[PDB]
Amino acid sequence: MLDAFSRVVVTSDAKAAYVGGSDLQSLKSFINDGNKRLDAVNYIVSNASCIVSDAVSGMICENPGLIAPGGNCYTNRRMAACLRDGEIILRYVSYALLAGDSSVLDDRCLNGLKETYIALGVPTASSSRAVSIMKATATAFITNTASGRKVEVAAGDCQALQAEAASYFDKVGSSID
């Protein structure tokens, strides 16, 4: 997998170029905003159970057919598998946010997910919805604007990190359906 730094390195390597100047510039900003990134990650992991259960439950309340006989969330086994998938996706999104690059998510998670869902009969459109609800919650926690929880932290602009986190959820969503 790659991180924000190696991503820059593979791009330079393609041009057999040393990394310096304008290249180092964005990496120094990454380092400069490193503490904010760690908080954003901490916010997501610290409310992981809340984010997943709420998104899965949200997907269900909007589409009750998921729990009717024959629905993909019907029986505890399926509901458990769905909750688990939700947690795995959030886990890979948190890794991507920690690394500042979607490489891990793409390679170890998204890589063949849609295919698996189609083969399992897992509804992709319902999955996208669970993911978009997680996006909503995670973006809220990152900016400390979550309705049911507020934490102490040095105030500042975390708009870039939340847009980044959001981009990761969107990637999952678009690769699924």
């Binding site: 997998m1 790659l2 991180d3 924000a4 730094f5 190696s6 820059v8 390195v9 330079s12 390597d13 057999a16 170029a17 040393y18 990394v19 310096g20 100047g21 180092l24 990496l27 120094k28 380092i31 490193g34 503490n35 760690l38 990650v41 901490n42 997501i44 992991v45 992981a48 795995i88 959030l90 886990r91 948190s94 890794y95 920690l98 690394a99 500042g100 891990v104 170890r108």
Partner: protein, 164 residues
């Protein structure tokens, strides 16, 4: 690409864990040390042509036998490939310093290097001569700060140890 970030995430991933305290703390290490390694990388990118010429001259000054018929430097083209190789290693070291790990040099320079040099009759000592020279040539604080120098030196010692 081995770095603090990929090492910590790979360990969490293997155990199916979300990033936790120790993962966030290891990355604080990046935050602190980046300045030192990015200075070394920057110095290298700005002056690599000079560093490589010296390293290559040092190699051939020590092993003039490479210029003999049938050896690794028996023709202009061969000699140019030698400097080119030192440049490639220096470029990978720059990458390694930027990434803060040996991933780049490991995967792109070291891996399979022993089979290639054995097959093409490229004596490891020549490369070692070039890297040992560059390492001992470093002058602190003339060329870079103390910590940038330590980072530059470790990277070189890492590459030297790969041919030993």
């Amino acid at each position: 690409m081995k770095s603090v970030i990929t090492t910590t995430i790979s360990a969490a991933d293997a155990a199916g864990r979300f990033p936790s305290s120790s993962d966030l703390e290891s990355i604080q290490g990046n935050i602190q040390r980046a300045a030192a390694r990015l200075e070394a990388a920057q110095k290298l990118s700005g002056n690599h042509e000079a560093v490589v010429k010296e390293a290559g001259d040092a190699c051939f000054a020590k092993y003039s036998y490479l210029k003999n018929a049938g050896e690794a430097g028996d023709s202009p083209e061969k000699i140019n490939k030698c400097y080119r190789d030192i440049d490639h290693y220096m470029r990978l070291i720059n990458y390694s310093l930027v990434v803060g790990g040996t991933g780049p040099v490991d995967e792109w320079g070291i891996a399979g290097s022993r089979e290639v040099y054995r097959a093409l009759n490229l004596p490891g000592s020549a490369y070692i001569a070039a890297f040992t020279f560059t390492r001992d040539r470093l002058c602190v604080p003339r060329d870079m700060s103390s910590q940038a120098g330590v980072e530059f030196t470790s990277a070189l010692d890492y590459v030297i140890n790969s041919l030993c």
